[PDB]
């Protein structure tokens, strides 16, 4: 998607309607005749499944449009079926409305009073007046039935008029979940009781019971087969008589189009062949395996030719008629089953080739594999390796990714300082550009170019447009993913939303693995024993905004499962805390100052004073000493914003008051006015624990200050463990 | 100590513009073919959960199979329009009529000249929508997509 | 030219019916997180395509940074349109909104 | 045979023309509409006049110097209606 190509029209909604035979024959670019895909010598056989006029095919200008293989969208053709056959989608609908009728009166076997009652109830549900219809039922010789029907009609029309005049329902109905529920219940009861009529009510003469042994065939009993054209004509007559009653069973919003619903929709008068573009042959080096859809259409075309020939033989004219009639009937049945197979691959009789329904039904179908979860562009995957010195809101992109992934930045008067030198760099000299998308939309390439010509191109990035029509737009440079950009990092499986965060990218110089800070371990539930995860690189500013602000790693400190935190340093830093903030921890002036500058380097903005401040030594004589408590205190004092007091907090940790000696008070932690005066930092303080110091900093100074505190605490505990080890042994 | 055979030169991949599954126009599947990565249901639902609407619309639509397809305003179909051979515009087929029954006349490469049907405009959609349109019109189901600015 | 006029008139009449008057709205006066994110993204896009520059450029090049600088001084010339479930919308200018 | 035809188009405005939206619509669409035959009008457009931008807030006075212009979601472009009378020439 290009931001410089604006789209005005938008799809408000779509509606699911049956396509009719007459409509198809008007749109089609051609109807196909022969069941041969393509003749020898390599050209496609005119009139076959492929054709010049069904879409440009393998270096053959399309006849329908006149454009090449890339610039031909494809055009739709149709197959003239000699006879109308069942549509397997609607066979249960056709088989419910095939029964429940009197074949003589050509009404339903239900008394027209009940039929009209259901019609008006469903018309009231068309407009949402659900309770009004329940009173419509509260209305209780043949010439009086006409008056009863007229009274119900007046009642319904007047209720509709009042609701529309009351500002309660517009001209397009009011359809919602509850009204849908009652409509479904009403229709299901309608059908359940509509088959309860074994004897007609308009003219009480019995009718045969239609018995279907399986799809593609329906049998009558007083056994006898019934042709499909008979079923079509029967239900055509029934629908003609009861068009007013089925107009409200096959509709939910007011049919403002007022187009009559037929029985032609229930039958396959024509099959539709998608453009050739959608049945291109499986090409595998030399192997060419034609489409299963092409094979099924070839089979249906073969059956069409055979049944047409049998019909013609019968037309050119006893016993010969008997055998030709048996063969014609079998041709009918076989083409019916072949159409049923071209649509559905499980109703057939005969492992079977996938049908067009089978491209949708379950997972790996067109819904749960190419619409819900697609396969994305401008993304990368790798294996994660840990890396402190990464700010807990950053991710370390390897140079390979840092040179492949790109972003289209449009050139302005203020950007040509850096995009010009990015073009000068080239596609390999990081940072740099890999493409220039011009005003005309042309994508000038830089991969195969010389540095001299690259600089020459750079000298014309921000030129005026000599095109009257493109004066609005400007050139874009596909710059490499710089240090300022944002990346949506996810690690499958995504059991919760916090597992797909947005990090700021740091372009590491060395190795091919996504280097990620330790804090996010619980957030992704990740390890580093070869865990793989993916980085998605958004391509427009509006997408950058959400990962930078809404899904930003700072914004993700508390999981909404309980509001608890799922950040905090994990394994080494916790034990470094149990040791560094001990009473035994005393630090000379040099050691303490190095520890403080080792993590709060004020050359990028670690501390909020622009000149490090120290703390008076805890033990003055004999020589100036310090404590780890003071280390935590001065780290907090440096990271915390100025013109604001320090934190006050009382809490506990997991280490009892017996594991420190008699009369000890290290188990209870106390921060007073931004100074650590008692207690040892633990898992409870920083880690996956609630109400600790880092949680309190989050709640008081904001989430960003808590993120900076996590980075500095990690860096400090690391620099302290790289100057003082911590090991498990066999004596332990 | 043992060196296991799960090195990084086998398990790193980075995707940009390139090969696409031509029937559904989403990038092909495979490390060897330089194919993209799946953003499945569990990733889409998480992307929605953060409230990230533009992010999800960029991962799901703008990057994989975004296409500016012409749609006829009146008939509400995508795969019905076509280009017109000059003697240069876009016209429709379903709601255009043959010139035998009738300026606004446009001709195909077959020479069959039609009149009308010039009520079409651009709509940005996933290509898989167009493919579902085809695989539904094969079954006889017609999806009519009414544009907003009629 | 006459059914078109009816179409336009019905469009604008339903538009005015839905549009809540300024002095009746009952939505939260803050600029929520989603609204702030979308405002920043949209104004950044505009800046990229040579939109007007109000706030001074202290060397910034990331358009999201220029958008944040505009949001700091509330110079962003956009308008949120919060939609109610019924379809009725309340327009809130960026300035009327109190962020955090 | 010069006819004044009042048209009502749905034009799209660039970010660079938020400062002069009237001149923006004139430079983007109306100027690419002069002297060219238009089938949606009937003749050949000699000129334009009375460019008037509609509003996205119905509760604004007819002379509200600032009108809300809806912004397309994916792009930084605005899309809005404009009523304008063209001095067209029809043979």
């Amino acid at each position: 998607m290009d931001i410089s190509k604006p789209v005005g029209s938008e799809i408000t909604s779509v509606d699911f309607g049956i396509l009719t035979a007459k409509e198809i024959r008007n749109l089609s670019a051609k109807q196909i005749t022969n069941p041969t895909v393509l003749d020898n010598l390599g050209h496609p056989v005119s009139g076959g499944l492929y054709d010049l006029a069904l879409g440009a095919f393998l270096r053959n200008l399309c006849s329908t449009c006149g454009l090449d293989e890339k610039f031909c969208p494809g055009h739709q053709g149709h197959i003239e079926l000699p006879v109308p056959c069942y549509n397997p989608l609607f066979f249960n609908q056709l088989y419910i409305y095939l029964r429940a009728s009197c074949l003589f009166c050509h009404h339903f076997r239900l008394k027209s009073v009940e039929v009209h009652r259901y019609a008006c109830k469903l018309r009231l549900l068309q407009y949402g007046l659900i309770d009004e219809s329940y009173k419509l039922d509260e209305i209780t010789s043949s010439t009086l039935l006409n008056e009863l029907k007229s009274k119900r009609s007046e009642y319904v029309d007047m209720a509709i008029a009042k609701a529309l005049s009351d500002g309660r329902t517009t001209e397009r109905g009011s359809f919602t979940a509850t009204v849908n529920d009652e409509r479904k219940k009403l229709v299901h009861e309608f059908h359940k009781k509509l088959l309860s009529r074994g004897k007609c009510d308009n003219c009480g003469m019995f009718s045969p019971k239609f018995r279907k042994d399986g799809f593609t065939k329906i049998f009558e009993t007083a056994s006898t087969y019934i042709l499909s054209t008979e079923v079509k004509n029967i239900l055509d007559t029934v629908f003609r008589k009861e068009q007013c009653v089925l107009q409200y069973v096959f509709h939910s919003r007011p049919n403002l189009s007022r187009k009559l619903v037929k029985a032609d929709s229930f039958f396959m008068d024509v099959l539709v062949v998608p453009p050739t573009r959608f049945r291109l042959p499986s090409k595998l080096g030399e192997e060419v395996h034609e489409n299963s859809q092409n094979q099924l259409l070839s089979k249906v075309l073969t059956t069409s030719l055979l049944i047409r020939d049998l019909n013609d033989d019968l037309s050119k004219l006893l016993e010969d008629r008997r055998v030709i009639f048996s063969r014609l009937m079998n041709a009918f049945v076989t083409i019916q089953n072949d159409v049923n197979a071209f649509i559905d691959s499980t109703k057939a009789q005969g492992v079977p080739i996938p049908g067009v329904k089978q491209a949708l039904e379950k997972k790996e179908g067109l819904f749960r594999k190419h619409m819900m979860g697609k396969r994305v562009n401008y993304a990368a995957r790798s294996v994660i390796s840990p890396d402190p010195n990464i700010e807990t809101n950053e991710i370390g992109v390897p140079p390979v990714f840092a040179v492949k992934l790109t972003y289209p930045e449009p050139v302005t008067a203020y950007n040509i300082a850096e995009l010009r030198q990015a073009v000068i760099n080239g596609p390999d000299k990081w940072p740099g550009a890999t493409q220039i998308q011009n005003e005309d939309g042309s994508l000038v390439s830089l991969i195969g170019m010389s540095v001299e010509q690259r600089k020459a191109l750079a000298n014309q990035l921000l030129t005026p447009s000599s095109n009257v029509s493109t004066h609005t737009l400007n050139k874009k440079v596909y710059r490499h993913i710089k240090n300022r950009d944002v990346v949506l990092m996810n690690r499958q499986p995504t059991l919760h939303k916090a597992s797909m965060m947005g990090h700021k990218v740091r372009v590491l110089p060395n190795e091919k693995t996504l280097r990620l800070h330790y804090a996010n371990t619980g957030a992704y539930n990740a390890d580093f024993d070869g865990d793989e995860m993916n980085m998605h690189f958004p391509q427009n500013e509006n997408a950058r905004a959400e990962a930078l602000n809404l899904a930003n790693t700072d914004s993700q400190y508390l999981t909404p499962t309980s509001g608890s935190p799922v950040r905090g340093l994990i394994q080494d830093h916790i034990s470094a805390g149990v040791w560094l903030t001990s009473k035994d921890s005393f630090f000379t002036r040099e050691q303490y100052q190095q520890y403080i500058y080792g993590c709060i380097r004020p050359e990028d903005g670690h501390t909020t004073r622009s000149k490090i401040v120290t703390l008076p030594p805890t033990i003055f004589k004999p020589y100036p000493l310090w404590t780890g408590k003071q280390i935590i205190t001065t780290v907090l004092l440096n990271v915390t914003p100025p013109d604001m007091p320090g934190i006050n907090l009382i809490s506990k940790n997991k280490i009892k008051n017996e594991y420190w000696g008699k009369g000890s008070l290290e188990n209870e932690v106390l921060f007073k006015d931004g100074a650590l005066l008692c207690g040892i930092l633990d898992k409870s303080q920083y880690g996956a624990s609630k109400y600790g110091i880092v949680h309190s900093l989050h709640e008081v100074y904001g989430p960003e200050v808590a993120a900076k505190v996590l980075s500095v605490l990690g860096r400090l505990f690391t620099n302290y463990i790289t100057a003082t080890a911590f090991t498990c042994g066999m004596d332990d | 100590y043992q060196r296991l055979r799960h090195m990084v030169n086998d398990k790193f991949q980075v995707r940009s513009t390139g090969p696409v599954n031509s029937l559904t126009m989403q990038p092909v599947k495979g490390r060897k073919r330089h194919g993209g990565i799946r953003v499945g249901e569990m990733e889409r639902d998480a992307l929605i959960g953060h409230g990230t609407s533009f992010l999800l619309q960029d991962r799901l639509l703008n990057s994989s199979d975004y296409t500016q397809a012409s749609v006829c305003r009146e008939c509400g179909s995508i795969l019905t329009t076509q280009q017109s051979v000059p003697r240069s515009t876009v016209c429709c087929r379903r709601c255009s009529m043959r010139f035998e029954d009738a300026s606004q006349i446009w001709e195909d490469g077959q020479g069959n000249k039609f009149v009308g049907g010039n009520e079409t405009t651009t709509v940005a959609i996933p290509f898989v929508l167009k493919y579902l349109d085809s695989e539904l019109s094969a079954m006889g189901i017609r999806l009519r997509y009414n544009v907003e600015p009629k | 030219p006459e059914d078109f006029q009816q179409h336009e008139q019905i469009r604008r009449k339903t538009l005015k019916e839905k549009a809540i008057p300024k002095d009746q709205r009952a939505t939260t006066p803050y600029m929520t997180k989603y609204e702030r994110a979308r405002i920043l993204g949209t104004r950044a896009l505009q800046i990229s395509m040579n939109a007007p520059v109000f706030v001074d450029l202290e060397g910034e090049t990331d358009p999201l940074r220029i958008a944040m600088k505009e949001l700091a001084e509330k110079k962003i010339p956009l308008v949120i349109r919060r939609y109610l479930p019924d379809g009725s919308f309340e327009d809130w200018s960026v300035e009327e909104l109190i962020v955090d | 045979c010069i006819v004044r035809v009042p048209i009502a188009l749905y034009v799209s405005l660039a970010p660079m023309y938020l400062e002069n939206p009237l001149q923006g619509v004139m430079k983007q669409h109306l100027n690419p509409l002069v002297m060219k035959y238009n089938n949606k009008v009937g003749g050949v457009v000699l000129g334009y006049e009375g460019l008037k931008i509609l509003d996205a807030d119905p509760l604004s006075k007819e002379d509200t110097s600032e009108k809300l212009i809806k912004i397309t979601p994916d792009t930084p472009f605005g899309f809005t209606w404009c009523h304008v009378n063209l001095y067209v020439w029809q043979p």
């Binding site: 029509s469 737009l473 | - | 030219p1 | 048209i7 799209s12 009008v41």
Partner: peptide, 18 residues
């Protein structure tokens, strides 16, 4: 040429010609 950047999406006649 002749895209949404350069051509109106929908151009109607408000009334009859005058």
């Amino acid at each position: 040429t002749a895209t949404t950047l350069n051509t109106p999406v929908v151009i109607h006649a408000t009334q009859l010609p005058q």
